[PDB]
Amino acid sequence: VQFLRTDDEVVLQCSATVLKEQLKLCLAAEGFGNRLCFLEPTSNAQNVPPDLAICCFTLEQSLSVRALQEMLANGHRTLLYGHAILLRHAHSRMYLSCLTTSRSMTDKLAFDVGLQEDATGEACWWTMHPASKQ
């Protein structure tokens, strides 16, 4: 029943299914010479260990929507749905953000996600929502 709190290390993990096989991958970025992120597979660790040194992130700050708007205009706090959060890379000390470069071609309305040096702007803040109905 443990709840997520600010100022701690955390890893973002997805879940894909290909050829009736479940693969668990985690977001990872280098940050030095390459800003773009990629899914490194954390599965099959027995045969090949993954590179987890560039997969750790830190919940630098969680804030309300209106508080975030006011702070843009200008204690391990618990995280709850509907609150913006700031993610910082552990190695490069650069904040995760949504860049304006659209490198994909299949989906024209798709942007890219990468690390940026500064925390200024609204591109580095992400809002959490409940996936399930419960």
């Binding site: 280098e30 010479g33 190695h91």
Partner: protein, 49 residues
Amino acid sequence: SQAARMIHSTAGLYNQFIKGLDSFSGKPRGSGPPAGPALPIEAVILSLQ
């Protein structure tokens, strides 16, 4: 720790760049490009900066 991590990444990238440079050494390109993979010039430039 940070210095070691950048040393590892930079060494890998520069070794790839050196191998790419040595791939087409001594053979003119001619019409088509060398069969080797495209050199990571953007990554090298960003790492140098």
